[PDB]
Amino acid sequence: LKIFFPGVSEFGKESILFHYTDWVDDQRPENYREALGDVVGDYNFICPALEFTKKFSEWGNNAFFYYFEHRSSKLPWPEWMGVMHGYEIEFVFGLPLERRDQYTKAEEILSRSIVKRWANFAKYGNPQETQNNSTSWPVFKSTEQKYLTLNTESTRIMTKLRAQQCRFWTSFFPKV
Amino acid sequence: LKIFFPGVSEFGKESILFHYTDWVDDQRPENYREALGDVVGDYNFICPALEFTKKFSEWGNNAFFYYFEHRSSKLPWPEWMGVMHGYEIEFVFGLPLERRDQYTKAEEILSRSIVKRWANFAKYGNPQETQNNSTSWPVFKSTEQKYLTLNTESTRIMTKLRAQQCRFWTSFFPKV
Amino acid sequence: DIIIATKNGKVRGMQLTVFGGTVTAFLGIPYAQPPLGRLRFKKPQSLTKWSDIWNATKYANSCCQNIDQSFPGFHGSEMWNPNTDLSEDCLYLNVWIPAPKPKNATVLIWIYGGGFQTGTSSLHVYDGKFLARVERVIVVSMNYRVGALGFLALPGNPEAPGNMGLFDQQLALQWVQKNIAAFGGNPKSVTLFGESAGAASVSLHLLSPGSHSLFTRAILQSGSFNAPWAVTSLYEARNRTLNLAKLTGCSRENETEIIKCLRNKDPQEILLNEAFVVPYGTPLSVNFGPTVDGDFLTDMPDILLELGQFKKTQILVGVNKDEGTAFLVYGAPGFSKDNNSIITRKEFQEGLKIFFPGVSEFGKESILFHYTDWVDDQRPENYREALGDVVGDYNFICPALEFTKKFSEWGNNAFFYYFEHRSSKLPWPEWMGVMHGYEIEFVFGLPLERRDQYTKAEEILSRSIVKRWANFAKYGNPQETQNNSTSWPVFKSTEQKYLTLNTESTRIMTKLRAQQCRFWTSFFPKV
Ligand SMILES: *[C@@H]1O[C@H](CO[C@H]2O[C@@H](C)[C@@H](O)[C@@H](O)[C@@H]2O)[C@@H](O[C@@H]2O[C@H](CO)[C@@H](O)[C@H](O)[C@H]2NC(C)=O)[C@H](O)[C@H]1NC(C)=O
Ligand SMILES: *[C@@H]1O[C@H](CO[C@H]2O[C@@H](C)[C@@H](O)[C@@H](O)[C@@H]2O)[C@@H](O[C@@H]2O[C@H](CO)[C@@H](O)[C@H](O)[C@H]2NC(C)=O)[C@H](O)[C@H]1NC(C)=O
Ligand SMILES: *[C@@H]1O[C@H](CO[C@H]2O[C@@H](C)[C@@H](O)[C@@H](O)[C@@H]2O)[C@@H](O)[C@H](O)[C@H]1NC(C)=O
Ligand SMILES: *[C@@H]1O[C@H](CO)[C@@H](O)[C@H](O)[C@H]1NC(C)=O
Ligand SMILES: *[C@@H]1O[C@H](CO)[C@@H](O)[C@H](O)[C@H]1NC(C)=O
Ligand SMILES: *[C@@H]1O[C@H](CO)[C@@H](O)[C@H](O)[C@H]1NC(C)=O
Ligand SMILES: *[C@@H]1O[C@H](CO)[C@@H](O)[C@H](O)[C@H]1NC(C)=O
Ligand SMILES: *[C@@H]1O[C@H](CO)[C@@H](O)[C@H](O)[C@H]1NC(C)=O
Ligand SMILES: *P(=O)(O)N(CC)CC
Ligand SMILES: [Cl-]
Ligand SMILES: [Cl-]
Ligand SMILES: [Cl-]
Ligand SMILES: [Cl-]
Ligand SMILES: [Cl-]
Ligand SMILES: [Cl-]
Ligand SMILES: [Cl-]
Ligand SMILES: [Cl-]
Ligand SMILES: [Cl-]
Ligand code: NA
Ligand code: NA
Numbered sequence: 001l002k003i004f005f006p007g008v009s010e011f012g013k014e015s016i017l018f019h020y021t022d023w024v025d026d027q028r029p030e031n032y033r034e035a036l037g038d039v040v041g042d043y044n045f046i047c048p049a050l051e052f053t054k055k056f057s058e059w060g061n062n063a064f065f066y067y068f069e070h071r072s073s074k075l076p077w078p079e080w081m082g083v084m085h086g087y088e089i090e091f092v093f094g095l096p097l098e099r100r101d102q103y104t105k106a107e108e109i110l111s112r113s114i115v116k117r118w119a120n121f122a123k124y125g126n127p128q129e130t131q132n133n134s135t136s137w138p139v140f141k142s143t144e145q146k147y148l149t150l151n152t153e154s155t156r157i158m159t160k161l162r163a164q165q166c167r168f169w170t171s172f173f174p175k176v
Numbered sequence: 177l178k179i180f181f182p183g184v185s186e187f188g189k190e191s192i193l194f195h196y197t198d199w200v201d202d203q204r205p206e207n208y209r210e211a212l213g214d215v216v217g218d219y220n221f222i223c224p225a226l227e228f229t230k231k232f233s234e235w236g237n238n239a240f241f242y243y244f245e246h247r248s249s250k251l252p253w254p255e256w257m258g259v260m261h262g263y264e265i266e267f268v269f270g271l272p273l274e275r276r277d278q279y280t281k282a283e284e285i286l287s288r289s290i291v292k293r294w295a296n297f298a299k300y301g302n303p304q305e306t307q308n309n310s311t312s313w314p315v316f317k318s319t320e321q322k323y324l325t326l327n328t329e330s331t332r333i334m335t336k337l338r339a340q341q342c343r344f345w346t347s348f349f350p351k352v
Numbered sequence: 353d354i355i356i357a358t359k360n361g362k363v364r365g366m367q368l369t370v371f372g373g374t375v376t377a378f379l380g381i382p383y384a385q386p387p388l389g390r391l392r393f394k395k396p397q398s399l400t401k402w403s404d405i406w407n408a409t410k411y412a413n414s415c416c417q418n419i420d421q422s423f424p425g426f427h428g429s430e431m432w433n434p435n436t437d438l439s440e441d442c443l444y445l446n447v448w449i450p451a452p453k454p455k456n457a458t459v460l461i462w463i464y465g466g467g468f469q470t471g472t473s474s475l476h477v478y479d480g481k482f483l484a485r486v487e488r489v490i491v492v493s494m495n496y497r498v499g500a501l502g503f504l505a506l507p508g509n510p511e512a513p514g515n516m517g518l519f520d521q522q523l524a525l526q527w528v529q530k531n532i533a534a535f536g537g538n539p540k541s542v543t544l545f546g547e548s549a550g551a552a553s554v555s556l557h558l559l560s561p562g563s564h565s566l567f568t569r570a571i572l573q574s575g576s577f578n579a580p581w582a583v584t585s586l587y588e589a590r591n592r593t594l595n596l597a598k599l600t601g602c603s604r605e606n607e608t609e610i611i612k613c614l615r616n617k618d619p620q621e622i623l624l625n626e627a628f629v630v631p632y633g634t635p636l637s638v639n640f641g642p643t644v645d646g647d648f649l650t651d652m653p654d655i656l657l658e659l660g661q662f663k664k665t666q667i668l669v670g671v672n673k674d675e676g677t678a679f680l681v682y683g684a685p686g687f688s689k690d691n692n693s694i695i696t697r698k699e700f701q702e703g704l705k706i707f708f709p710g711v712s713e714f715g716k717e718s719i720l721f722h723y724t725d726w727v728d729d730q731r732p733e734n735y736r737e738a739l740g741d742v743v744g745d746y747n748f749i750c751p752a753l754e755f756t757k758k759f760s761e762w763g764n765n766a767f768f769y770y771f772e773h774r775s776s777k778l779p780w781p782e783w784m785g786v787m788h789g790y791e792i793e794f795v796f797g798l799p800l801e802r803r804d805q806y807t808k809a810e811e812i813l814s815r816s817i818v819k820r821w822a823n824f825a826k827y828g829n830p831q832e833t834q835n836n837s838t839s840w841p842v843f844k845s846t847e848q849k850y851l852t853l854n855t856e857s858t859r860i861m862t863k864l865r866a867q868q869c870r871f872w873t874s875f876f877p878k879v
Binding site: 200201203280281282285309332333334335340 | 727728730807808809812836859860861862867
Binding site for chain 1: 187190191194198348351352
């Protein structure tokens with residue numbers, strides 16, 4: 001926390017530790033490894049993207065939020081780093097549509113779908129994949145905060161990503 | 177804080193200090209004297225009474241909440257202790273209706289009104305003073321949290337007493 | 353060196369250090385032909401075009417006007433008196449711009465009050481250099497003609513049509529439309545703001561077809577055109593124009609001759625006679641003000657308001673906690689700024705005669721009935737407090753609240769403030785409380801100057817108002833979004849939520865003076 005939160009009241013940092021280390025439970029050895037990464041990505045990316053989406057949508061425009069959960073079959077970084085920052089891009093750009101290329105079959109399908117949703121969004125303002133019985137992507141509203149999960153198995157509609165974490169980053173931390 | 181919050185993580189207590197000492201501004205010499213009392217009465221009385229009232233009312237019953245702001249003309253405790261715990265009782269019981277007794281005129285009127293509201297509540301479930309162009313006492317709802325202020329000058333309808341303080345006592349502190 | 357090219361010529365401004373930074377100020381830019389001689393009492397005539405550099409390096413002449421001589425040497429009163437020479441050649445304006453030159457800055461245009469009989473844009477409390485520095489808006493202010501010179505009316509007749517001084521403001525809003533891009537300003541984002549008669553002025557430009565496209569939003573501090581002092585009737589205006597003629601031996605039979613005669617008079621002769629054009633007036637008399645002229649104002653403005661005939665845009669509207677007090681030392685028996693002014697019932701009564709001259713007896717008993725049902729009859733400052741509430745509720749507070757309601761019923765967002773902070777530096781005594789006119793220095797940021805003996809809580813208070821005023825102007829929403837500030841709710845009929853402005857805690861409340869204004873608003877207009 002000292003690395004990532006340099007100045008950084010001591011109480012600021014205890015507060016991050018308090019929020020992120022109420023273990024369930026204190027047994028699991030990868031507890032603190034998993035907490036540091038969530039701290040970093042929730043503070044830096046996830047809550048600020050969710051807060052932008054809320055505020056933006058409160059002025060009346062349609063907004064769609066995704067949660068990307070697929071780890072590349074070809075990721076060179078180790079397993080513990082999971083679904084990393086930067087690693088949806090090759091799905092968005094379609095690199096897995098190139099079969100010459102050693103991605104799984106489920107990855108081609110996954111990327112074909114994202115490409116289609118990205119392109120429908122661009123042409124028509126609506127990120128639907130309309131042909132293949134795909135889960136329908138609901139608009140994101142304050143109040144419901146529905147988002148769509150992107151993964152090889154089943155995509156889901158869920159609500160209020162990191163509600164508890166981001167209440168922390170969003171209401172409390174800016175105060176310290 | 178050590179006196180009132182004995183065991184009492186150190187971080188618990190810093191958190192109270194953080195919440196209650198963001199001065200506006202750091203100039204005022206009675207800043208810390210005023211903060212300690214608010215800490216004590218918000219934690220011990222005010223937020224728990226407001227949370228009870230909310231939760232109770234969420235099940236459908238009419239609920240009325242008052243904020244008593246009048247300091248007795250006869251208070252023996254010093255001025256800085258202000259509108260103290262325990263000192264509405266003599267207004268509720270009508271002691272100021274006894275003129276023999278050295279309370280101001282505005283205090284007789286104030287107590288006559290409370291007596292009337294207390295008694296109408298008891299007989300009719302509605303704490304209104306209906307005859308003397310009195311401010312009407314709105315029910316307390318979650319959502320609006322309207323309450324009525326009781327004082328000699330003008331009674332008011334206000335909303336969300338100590339909203340910021342009690343978010344602290346109510347959501348956060350129980351965690352420490 | 354800082355020269356800006358305008359449609360009529362180049363103008364040179366001056367640099368100013370404010371808070372370790374710099375604002376450029378162009379004080380004294382002319383915006384119309386001087387309204388002298390043949391032009392006296394006429395609509396401002398557009399400005400000719402000058403080669404060479406006009407130097408805008410000091411404030412210009414203030415318009416001719418009577419001066420407050422009640423309290424010589426007293427800063428409370430004399431802070432409002434003019435501080436540049438009086439002259440009929442007073443049609444000038446001031447521009448303050450952030451340094452560096454902003455790219456497309458929001459514009460705040462100030463319109464001073466003074467009962468339409470007095471005032472000037474060059475007062476210290478109207479100095480927009482703090483706003484420019486702090487919020488990087490552009491501040492513009494203008495002098496416009498006051499008294500008979502600015503509002504004499506002989507309805508229909510262009511030699512003295514009425515409302516000239518509102519036309520002066522207008523022609524100034526025009527100069528901003530044509531000229532303010534040159535200065536880095538956005539003509540498409542202009543907010544008018546003004547206090548007292550200056551606020552009534554802002555509210556009539558909301559009603560004037562000719563002003564519709566010369567601004568975006570409006571702020572009205574302690575004033576609106578539905579206040580009882582704000583519009584002179586056609587009846588009264590004629591009486592007054594003829595009474596003026598009579599008093600200067602200018603009675604004629606050819607109204608065009610009355611005017612030619614009045615144009616031979618000299619400014620002092622005219623000024624000197626204004627106060628007596630009415631059999632009696634009050635400390636709140638507006639002898640020569642706005643009239644329905646069929647030009648600037650096309651119909652009684654109460655009718656325009658009721659029937660939704662005004663520019664559709666957001667408004668910010670406010671009043672101060674003790675509007676009425678300042679007037680009581682100008683003629684109410686037993687009042688004085690030099691003591692605590694505990695008056696008697698019979699004094700209260702004689703005071704209603706002061707403020708409510710004609711004035712059915714029953715009208716006045718009705719005010720007494722409404723305002724003297726004591727709770728309770730014990731308190732010695734009871735009648736002192738009632739007279740001031742009477743005066744400020746009738747004259748400012750209820751008419752501002754009624755304007756806000758009616759305006760908002762047509763669909764626009766509206767925000768209402770209740771200003772409750774008394775200046776740590778107020779020279780007037782304590783009993784006069786939060787006085788009319790004393791929010792202005794907070795709005796203009798004078799308390800941001802620490803050199804200056806305001807408390808810390810006052811700096812913070814003014815920084816916040818500045819921020820809310822500026823967000824309103826740029827974005828139509830008077831929020832202070834960064835510092836966990838109370839959120840300012842829109843004002844709706846039905847709820848009538850308003851925000852309180854004070855050093856301790858700001859609140860959301862509802863239905864300011866509900867009981868008082870039911871009185872002024874439904875009942876009194878009947879008497
Ligand atoms: C409309 O004007 C007349 C004019 O009366 C005035 O004469 C002016 C030149 C000026 O000196 C002024 O002070 C003076 O009163 C008003 O008529 C007057 O009204 C009062 C009360 O009604 C009488 O006591 C005066 O004697 C009377 N004067 C004359 C010569 O008729 C009239 O009141 C006015 N209307 C209003 C009330 O504004
Ligand atoms: C508060 O002062 C007022 C104002 O009148 C006076 O101003 C004082 C400060 C003092 O210089 C005094 O001599 C001056 O006249 C007082 O009202 C006055 O009351 C006096 C007492 O007889 C009357 O003579 C006046 O008519 C009246 N003045 C007017 C024209 O309004 C007032 O009595 C005083 N009261 C206090 C101390 O509460
Ligand atoms: C400056 O911005 C211009 C428009 O900005 C305004 O839009 C208005 C409708 C109003 O809402 C204001 O409050 C906005 O700020 C734009 O058209 C101009 O071209 C811009 N000029 C520049 C940068 O030179
Ligand atoms: C739709 O379905 C076909 C066959 O089932 C498949 O080949 C293709 O990848 C799908 N298209 C999209 C847009 O996902
Ligand atoms: C109602 O009013 C009367 C007279 O104004 C007063 O004596 C009494 O105290 C009031 N009653 C109540 C219930 O407050
Ligand atoms: C304008 O001011 C500048 C000061 O440098 C100078 O050129 C000149 O004296 C002025 N022009 C006048 C006085 O008309
Ligand atoms: C009145 O005489 C004046 C002299 O200029 C003139 O303005 C006007 O035409 C005359 N009005 C009439 C027709 O009486
Ligand atoms: C916001 O907060 C800072 C520090 O607490 C303060 O210096 C500043 O005055 C505030 N800004 C506004 C717009 O009130
Ligand atoms: P304002 O301009 O101060 N004014 C309204 C008439 C009070 C005298
Ligand atoms: Cl475990
Ligand atoms: Cl799917
Ligand atoms: Cl989650
Ligand atoms: Cl302080
Ligand atoms: Cl009441
Ligand atoms: Cl509170
Ligand atoms: Cl009393
Ligand atoms: Cl606040
Ligand atoms: Cl009120
Ligand atoms: Na915390
Ligand atoms: Na009546």
